[PDB]
């Protein structure tokens, strides 16, 4: 009976601490204006002590359920894309579903770094279309607790946020997810990494916190690979949907830095004013970036029937993806 | 055009160190025969120094691709259910796809504790049916590196293994995944936990060693909750498929301990000889147990057309799931 999924509700959430560039530039000994000049970020939100990932995700997901006006019994599955779960075991998604009252919902976490939401969105859409039941698709990260002071990119980019979307079944064809392209390139596996705490080097007694913080070999190599991943996946879903960049109403790339968004937008020939930009006020929260941006743009101007979105992301791994969605 | 998915190829892999009960009983100071008496495990495999999660997953995945005789280009997606990735960042699945030559494959990790494979299988089936493209569904864990010798259940059950299934598109209806039920119950979130390393208590200098290892408040509460989760999800997918226990050819529960498998089997009215039992030789490797058991039972006696399998699992979180699959 079901032939597409509908993005029925949107939500986002950020912690209470707004962190201006000037605080961080002072910490790192950077000249005034450095961060906005190089990243396009002006401020970002950071967790305070006692804030949990699942609590942040809960506020974004509650906002999306409310937006969708959906009965809690209708949520069959909760997917949480996160790289920073409350605990390494269990996953945070069952706690998320429990706090939100989603008593008929399954729950699992997805770990796809910055690409996690587009994977979760593609997989949720397949579930909606196969079982004719609704899915809560959340993405949330507290990257502030992963910040490495020696890794300047992390200190200046990383932020904390959650976004969520309620996906409901729809009988109509030729709308919803028109195309999706999910790619991986593990030749870039070592470009962005946390050395310890996984199974290859469990965190042990004589280890420092910075062994458990992110490291990056060559930011420029990450930059060019990520632009290429997003460009190539975007080109493929456009061609698969038989559309051109001119048919896109809103372009929602992962918000890594402004120059990366500009590069992909330019490579695709998309008009710059079609790009949703939340990095100025919300920073880079990894997989939460796209659903937070979806919630922000829908609040500014509700998505209208017939509009076409292009979503695209790249991530450590390396991974990438793109989705064309028709309202 | 695609109406169902087919489990086209199976594979599994274990590390080289076979650890019999006697070694562990001496390590823990238990009387001889204690472990087999209480768990039904006789032996299990543990990683050696330098073994990686992705390398163990790679051997299971290559076996499954070989078994499926599939072109590498036909794999559109690699899903890796694991609680023990090589690193906290990035996910291990892109490395897995890379090492196996799956140059057209997306890749993401799923964190669903012991339920991780049934979630990944259900999500993969929806992907196969939506896009008409094949998926490698892997599950792998190195639990030995997470063992707390003081938590006796974990010391005597936990094992290291990988399993994998190649899911291919199939044009026929009334076969493949007939029904699936994914549930979560975050009221049991604190029952099985690792305290440190997540975002609620990140790894730091001078962290207690035990804080990075698995912990369990009430094994009996875990037991009865997990039995109920598996019983209730299995009853649901059976009724959704319009089947009874007598129609099941092979019953493949998560291999947690023999008494748990027997309790669920008995609850469902399933003939005990229909149960696939790998816990004796392979122990409890969390999400890997069901695909390892599929690989083992299909090797002993190839899955034949018309056979019906019932798969069920419960995990930390708590989560559960069940799948009815028609060959």
Numbering used by the authors:
A (entry chain A), B (entry chain B): 2 to 328
List passages from the publication reporting this PDB structure.
Using X-ray crystallography, we crystallized and solved the structure of AtBioZ at a 1.99 Å resolution. The dimeric nature of the AtBioZ protein belongs to the space group of P 21 21 21 and contains two protomers in per asymmetric unit (ASU), of which the refinement statistics are listed in Table 1. The lid domain of AtBioZ contains four α-helices and two β-sheets, which is covering on the ‘α/β/α/β/α’ core domain. The core domain of AtBioZ features a triple decked sandwich that is formed by nine β-sheets and ten α-helices. In brief, the β-sheets of β1 and β4–β7 are sandwiched between the helices α3–α5 and α6, together with helices of α13–α14 to form the first layer, while the sheets of β8–β11 are sandwiched between the helices of α9–α12 and α6, together with the helix of α13–α14 to form the other layer of the “sandwich”. Interestingly, a putative catalytic triad (C115, H255, and N285) is centered in the core domain of AtBioZ. Structural alignment revealed that the root-mean-square deviation (rmsd) of Cα atoms of AtBioZ is 2.8, 2.7 , and 1.2 Å, in comparison with FabB, FabF, and FabH, respectively, while the rmsd between FabB and FabF is 1.4 Å. The diameter of substrate entrance of both AtBioZ and FabH is measured to be around 5 Å. The depth of the substrate-loading tunnel in AtBioZ is 20 Å, quite longer than the counterpart (15 Å) of FabB. Unlike that the FabB substrate-binding pocket whose entrance is close to the dimeric interface, the entrance of the AtBioZ substrate-binding pocket is relatively far away from the dimeric interface. Similarly, the surface around the entrance of BioZ pocket is enriched with positively-charged amino acids, namely Arg39, Arg153, Arg221, and Arg260. In particular, we localize that three residues (S84, R147, and S287) at the distant bottom of the tunnel might neutralize the charge of free C-carboxyl group of the primer glutaryl-CoA.
